[PDB]
Design a protein around this ligand. Structure first.
Ligand SMILES: Nc1ncnc2c1ncn2[C@@H]1O[C@H](COP(=O)(O)OP(=O)(O)NP(=O)(O)O)[C@@H](O)[C@H]1O
Ligand SMILES: Nc1ncnc2c1ncn2[C@@H]1O[C@H](COP(=O)(O)OP(=O)(O)NP(=O)(O)O)[C@@H](O)[C@H]1O
Ligand SMILES: Nc1ncnc2c1ncn2[C@@H]1O[C@H](COP(=O)(O)OP(=O)(O)NP(=O)(O)O)[C@@H](O)[C@H]1O
Ligand SMILES: Nc1ncnc2c1ncn2[C@@H]1O[C@H](COP(=O)(O)OP(=O)(O)NP(=O)(O)O)[C@@H](O)[C@H]1O
Ligand SMILES: C[C@@H](CO)c1ccc(CC(=O)N2CCN(c3ccc(C#N)nn3)CC2)cc1
Ligand SMILES: C[C@@H](CO)c1ccc(CC(=O)N2CCN(c3ccc(C#N)nn3)CC2)cc1
Ligand SMILES: [Mg+2]
Ligand SMILES: [Mg+2]
Ligand SMILES: [Mg+2]
Ligand SMILES: [Mg+2]
Lengths: 352, 352
């Protein structure tokens, strides 16, 4: 049967699909038409229906997996459209993770003889992240950081080696945020989480601006000035708060200048989108910083789809984590964004 | 001259005023008319102008201070109205703290011969909190907690003894949030802060609901259901996330159900006010919890005017801190709310 792993999150479904490329002459004969149809559909289209997308740039080419060679594909669609997916499937051993592996278990079982194996969303995240870094991104580093993140004229993406990845703090920014302390391949802990995550960005942005997609919210934020909404240290002190080393540009109160009616009447949607992005991103960085200090871990890797096509938040995390930790913590990022749980689920197939 | 301490914050000015009650016969004669006018104005009115308020219920009666007996009064007004206050003063040694002691230093000096002494906002907070607990609230405890905070039929305010108050984590929830680790009367550190504070509650509430006061925002929140806006663990899993002990009712994504247009169209202003309150309150509790764990401190006292007339947030902090710490941390509260910096500033008078 086809080799899939699926991570059904609170907002997005992520699917990893292994396309064999070593199909012999006899194997092609023995391939049933429904299976050939699935493989050709997945590999000849980059858009599936109105809301599924194959992230072609992430494809791992000529990967050896379970003793076969193939291409590993990365596909996403909204969890809201899982009914379309399941209806397509009804018209296979599925390793599935995320909350939706449990929430929609009975729905997957409407597919006759389908064998669903539910796997833990954070176990799959850790296994998938370690796996992808181990095999490399087609010979390039999977992990990167922003060098000189405090100096815009210098700041640039650069590769980072994770060959000995432990210990590692993993900050998974999805709908909500989970924070993991990883001590070895089989020893990690969920330190805590925060509810101020990607769904808070998208939900608050939607309420405040009328945006109707994540991409629109980011486009608005790129044009906005968060300081039109936020109350800064310099708005309270007139300058720095010197005694505790707080710069005047630091945010004292997110959205705190919106207590003034005349400021609410002048602020733009773009300013509000950027203030929402800045508020959520700084809170994630600060929680990660406190967790790293307590866990005695100095490498913090941020993953999850809050950061897909979101260089603004990545650079803010890189700058803020470095600044507020006095250079003791380093922000790291991974090219495969939000797909690690789906890969980790796929990697569970040999156990069944 | 009159004995005042003033804390000029990012949103509110707090004023502590000592009314002498041991005025002799000769002292009354030597009292100049402008001074008698100030004392009678302050003690015969509970509303000053359109926006100043004396919190009569907080008055400390027959306090011995600087060798005299008197009543200690607690007065607040918006920082936006400090121009009215200074104009009243122009038509004295002022110990002043908060950011506004610096921001408005030149304005205070428009009052002829006035001597301004700027004091640190967190030093004054610590000194004032320790002082008020030491003298008691007219014989009652200044500090309280909520007993049995997880059981609504039992939950009740009860006094707490701080006679040996160290160590103590102090969470100051003003416009922004400062977190202090207090080891002795003269040894404390500002552990960190968060920008998601009282100004975020009021500013976001105002944007989302059109409320035009803090009190209106709380009234709205009391009628709302935050789960109409928030995405809960049970919305993602269908139930608890058992592996990591996350109950289905926990918030996975604040405002995370507002990514759906039809839910934005059905949610009420009251629901949005309550979701704003819950989001900000849980984040403050969680940051306090992480700081307490790292500082090895098990008593966390929450102060600042985000919590004035705000039993909803106090009870949520008491429940959440107890729940998420597995009973290892206790939330404490103080009757004098947001006045500690103003008292601490007053206590600096003998140094000048
Ligand atoms: N399964 C895989 N498929 C494709 N490329 C891989 C895979 N695993 C690792 N790689 C990449 O290819 C490189 C060589 O891997 P590999 O052929 O396993 O040699 P090796 O690991 O150095 N020695 P060994 O594992 O003992 O045979 C690695 O450094 C990765 O960059
Ligand atoms: N096309 C998109 N649609 C919706 N959200 C997007 C999209 N692209 C990026 N995002 C962001 O990515 C977040 C979801 O990230 P993701 O890691 O896929 O979470 P999830 O697994 O669905 N949720 P969770 O159950 O909390 O693990 C959203 O909250 C958005 O901030
Ligand atoms: N300055 C004060 N003015 C009014 N009441 C006070 C003051 N200081 C403390 N109190 C309260 O009054 C009680 C008695 O205080 P006090 O008269 O100082 O006796 P004491 O502290 O027990 N002994 P001592 O300080 O050595 O003279 C305290 O426990 C407080 O509740
Ligand atoms: N009447 C009120 N007007 C405005 N805000 C109020 C009022 N009553 C309570 N609040 C809340 O109290 C918060 C301000 O608390 P407060 O401790 O006085 O901060 P501040 O000292 O002015 N600010 P900061 O400079 O950050 O210390 C506001 O953000 C509101 O959430
Ligand atoms: C799995 C993923 C799905 O989306 C996810 C679930 C839940 C959460 C939230 C989370 O993990 N939480 C723990 C820490 N929480 C608090 C709250 C108050 C106090 C105090 N006082 N302490 N901790 C909030 C929720 C994220 C991601
Ligand atoms: C004095 C008072 C006035 O209102 C006040 C000032 C400032 C603040 C905010 C504060 O103290 N901050 C420190 C911690 N911050 C971050 C941000 C990102 C990362 C990472 N990565 N780490 N830390 C945010 C601001 C509160 C109160
Ligand atoms: Mg997820
Ligand atoms: Mg090898
Ligand atoms: Mg203050
Ligand atoms: Mg005594």
């Amino acid at each position: 049967s086809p080799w899939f792993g699926m991570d059904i999150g609170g907002t997005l479904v992520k699917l990893s699909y292994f396309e064999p490329i070593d199909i012999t002459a006899e194997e092609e004969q023995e391939e049933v038409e429904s299976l050939k149809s699935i493989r050709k559909y997945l590999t000849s289209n980059v858009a599936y229906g109105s809301t599924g997308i194959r992230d072609v740039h992430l494809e791992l080419k000529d990967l050896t997996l379970f003793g076969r060679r193939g291409n590993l594909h990365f596909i996403r669609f909204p969890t809201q459209d899982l009914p379309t997916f399941i209806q397509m499937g009804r018209d296979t051993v599925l390793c599935a993770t995320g909350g939706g592996a449990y929430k929609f278990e009975k729905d997957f079982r409407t597919i006759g003889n389908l064998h669903l194996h539910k796997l833990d969303e954070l176990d799959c995240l850790v296994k998938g992240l370690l796996y992808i870094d181990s095999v490399s991104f087609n010979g390039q580093a999977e992990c990167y950081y922003f060098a000189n993140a405090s100096e815009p004229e210098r700041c640039q993406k650069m590769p980072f080696n994770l060959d000995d990845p432990y210990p590692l703090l993993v900050v998974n920014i999805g709908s909500g945020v989970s924070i993991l302390a990883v001590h070895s391949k089989d020893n990690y802990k969920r330190v805590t989480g925060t509810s101020l995550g990607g769904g808070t960005f998208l939900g608050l942005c939607s309420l405040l601006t009328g945006c109707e997609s994540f991409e629109e919210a980011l486009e608005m934020a790129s044009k906005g000035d968060s300081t039109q909404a936020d109350k800064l240290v310099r708005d309270i002190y007139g300058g720095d708060y010197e005694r505790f080393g707080l710069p005047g540009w630091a945010v004292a109160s997110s959205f705190g200048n919106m207590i003034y009616k005349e400021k609410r009447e002048s602020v733009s949607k773009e300013d509000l989108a950027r203030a929402t992005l800045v508020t959520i991103t700084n809170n994630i960085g600060s929680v990660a910083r406190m967790c790293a200090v307590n866990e005695k871990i100095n490498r913090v890797v941020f993953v999850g789809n809050f950061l897909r096509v979101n260089t603004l938040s990545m650079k803010l995390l890189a700058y803020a984590l470095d600044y507020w930790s006095k250079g003791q913590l380093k922000a790291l990022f991974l090219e495969h964004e939000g797909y690690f749980g789906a890969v980790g689920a796929l990697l569970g197939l040999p156990n069944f």
